[PDB]
Design a protein around this ligand. Structure first.
Ligand code: MG
Lengths: 118, 118, 118
């Protein structure tokens, strides 16, 4: 996969996802939602999309990833939508691992308006 | 895919998911969780399940999708469980795009009670 | 799939995921995040990872699953990171169904630093 940028790491073959990094320091008070820039652009492989999902180490602090879908044709900078749903302030440091990207297959079906059975 | 109902849109082939729409206007104060009706029933293709996941435009407002799994055999009306985890009230308008549905493959394995290695 | 432990249930072939159970009673005040033990270890099938995602019955109460990725090589006890993002206290009972595990395919790609097109 072609990438451009400094915020995504090669993964081990036994891991599902690539680490995504914060491109700058981010402060999140309780309740705050911010789009965290990663500095990364990429060319997803044809036939696939990208799921941005939490790291367990980050989720255990009460930070959540909102949204999560990178469409095959998305070519701009990846932002991770992060919310502090905990009741303690958190600071994410520049270059800290904040989420992971997992590549999954796409399925395209026509929608047919009819009668749902069963 | 056979659908019945007015709250799901055809997608571009370069997009992962189908937009899901609110079937009525929904108000969410901070902290409120509601099951938002979409008015949609569908027949998932055999061998697949449906992931309901957030839209980036909605997640950036601090709304989250809870749950997310539509099982292949589910034939009733799709509801999107939405929570306002932000600290500002939000109104979702009738027919607004509130989430997306992505079709993913199913894997069925027997569970065997034994000794986990490695 | 080889499992070791008392907190994961066989699934119907028409369901996407396996139920995960709380290994002990858990109290969550509003805003609290806890790693809920399941008592389960497993050997994911090679070529796959495990997505821990919410049950609709649990998500409708305003509990969310944070994180969610079990990597193919993970052999320790599965913990479900659960947060009460609602404004009502909740108690999860011992052996209650708290989340589901869905097995999904892995995709491994090399990252190539270059110029993103299109
Ligand atoms: Mg969430």
């Amino acid at each position: 996969m072609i990438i451009e940028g400094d915020g995504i790491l090669d993964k081990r073959s036994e891991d599902a996802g690539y680490d995504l990094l914060a491109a700058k320091e981010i402060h999140l008070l309780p309740g705050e939602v911010k789009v965290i820039p990663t500095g990364v652009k990429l060319m997803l492989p044809k036939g696939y999309w990208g799921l941005i999902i939490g790291k367990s180490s980050i989720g255990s602090k009460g930070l959540d990833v909102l949204g999560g879908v990178i469409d095959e044709g998305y070519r701009g900078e990846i932002g991770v939508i992060m919310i502090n749903v905990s009741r303690k302030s958190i600071t994410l440091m520049e270059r800290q691992k904040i989420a992971q990207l997992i590549i999954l297959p796409c399925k395209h079906e026509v929608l047919e308006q009819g009668k749902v059975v069963m």
